[PDB]
Design a protein around this nucleic acid. Structure first.
Lengths: 272, 272
DNA sequence: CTTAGGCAACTGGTCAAACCAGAACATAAAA
DNA sequence: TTTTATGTTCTGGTTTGACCAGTTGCCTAAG
């Protein structure tokens, strides 16, 4: 393990399980330095990071106070909570799915009127790039499929000669998730209101973690593409009356798919 | 000024104006230590903070790369953005008001269904605590008016002495804004969906920044209170039928109030 | 020639021991 | 009694310079 990383995981977990409870005071830096096993400097960088995340309140002369997170932290903790409160990973995702289903008719609305075929262009881009499905397993010769530092996978949970067919399935899940997130976020910025885009930016780690498993099911990918083409039809037609109906039918359908995939969660699902 | 602070504002401002442009590479840590005037360690703490905010991408061996913010950062940058290009601080606020007017019918509906009782009680708490108006201006001998650390103003102003009654005006603005934020955020958490609460937690600095001036107007404060009571009437009544009417009449009304008050902006407005 | 070693010259990360500065509280002297 | 100093010692902030560790690429030595 690495010093700073272990320090951060130690402090965060100690706050979660109740060793550094919210509302108390984090012990002096000099003491955590010998309590954890890291030098003071490194521990201070960790502390600055965590405080910037909203776990702590720091100001010199006064003792470091352990914040009441969920009241100080932002949309980012939802990912961390998944690996801290795995028992309730069930609920978190369905919040993520609910929120997106609730606010999507809001920003897509405006997006379809203000920047109509910036919307249509990125949507078409997504749909046609989502032909990783009607192709043989290495489609990474199209696209100008160079900028994919986001989809990278070192699978080495292995024993046999199937690390090259499992890996490509996970790669497919990851790519479809890549384009899904691209769709929702880029459409969320073209609403003329930044906040809807910043929301997706905040939830991105959770979004990708959920998508990389949800899109390991072809049954979901085909509904996703159908959803995309329906949205495209809406934006092109220009009548937005049908938009909410589209979004909540997709919501309930993908909802049932998730209810099926909820039972058998990978056990690399809730981790860092 | 203090080292870490000047290093951070220097870096963020340099990224903003184009000296460390998005897409470029941040100079080596050893080079900025001598370009800025801070020791390397401190500069590293600053870098860790900024990277956690999403301004940079760090990994050792490779050069620190300056992220394309607005694609990496979250809801927090809107506040900094207010103080980086004040010229369009005009637009930013109108986003903060728009989003809130859009998503308020979303969570307030669910909050009025799941936790009707906690909703109305925290609302009642807010409304009755908002009797700082019908009282002589230093009213924090009520409430158990002790937990008041957000609630601080030694701005020092002055030429001499009517400078205990504008303080009290700004303090009235600050406390009313405090309760406004309490209402929206706490109602956003009692919806059963954490994300709506995390959104407000993320925007808290911008919300406080705008509110501390918007609520220096008594006419804005009582429209706010009548709004609170209308919402209370909705939650108590149990039919959510034009909760949305209530919310957007308040939206447009507060809209016009904001539209006259934008003209004369205090100009400690866009600063940290 | 080409190619597979391995050597530097980058980069960020960790480490050490002092010291600087704000905040607090006990306590002494003044009110 | 209460209250204004006042200073020791709590806390976090900054300094220094040295070393440790991945990354990349140049440049040998082997194919």
């Amino acid at each position: 393990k690495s010093p700073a990383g272990f320090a951060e995981k130690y402090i965060i977990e100690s706050i979660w399980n109740g060793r550094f409870p919210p509302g108390s005071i984090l012990p002096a830096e000099r003491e955590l330095s010998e309590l954890i096993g890291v030098t003071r400097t490194t521990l201070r960088e960790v502390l600055q990071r965590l405080a910037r995340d909203g776990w702590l309140t720091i100001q010199h002369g006064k003792p470091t106070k352990v914040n009441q997170f969920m009241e100080t932290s932002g949309l980012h903790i939802l990912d961390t909570l998944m690996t801290l409160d795995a028992e309730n990973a069930t609920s978190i995702v369905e919040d993520l799915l609910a929120a997106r289903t609730n606010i999507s008719p809001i920003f897509m609305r405006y997006a379809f009127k203000l920047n109509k075929e910036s919307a249509e262009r990125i949507m078409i881009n997504v749909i046609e790039s989502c032909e990783a499905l009607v192709n043989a397993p290495s489609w990474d010769a199209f696209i100008a499929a160079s900028p994919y530092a986001e989809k990278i996978q070192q699978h080495v949970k292995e024993d046999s000669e199937k690390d090259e067919l499992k890996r490509q399935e996970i790669l497919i899940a990851k790519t479809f998730n890549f384009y899904d997130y691209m769709l929702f976020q880029r459409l969320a910025f073209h609403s003329g209101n930044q906040i809807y885009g910043l929301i997706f930016n905040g939830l991105k780690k959770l979004y990708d973690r959920v998508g990389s498993y949800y899109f390991s099911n072809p049954q979901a990918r085909e509904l996703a593409m159908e959803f995309y083409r329906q949205l495209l039809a809406v934006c092109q037609s220009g009548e937005r009356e049908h938009l909410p109906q589209v979004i909540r039918q997709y919501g309930i359908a993908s909802g049932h798919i998730w209810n099926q995939m909820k039972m058998t969660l990978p056990s690399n699902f809730t981790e860092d």
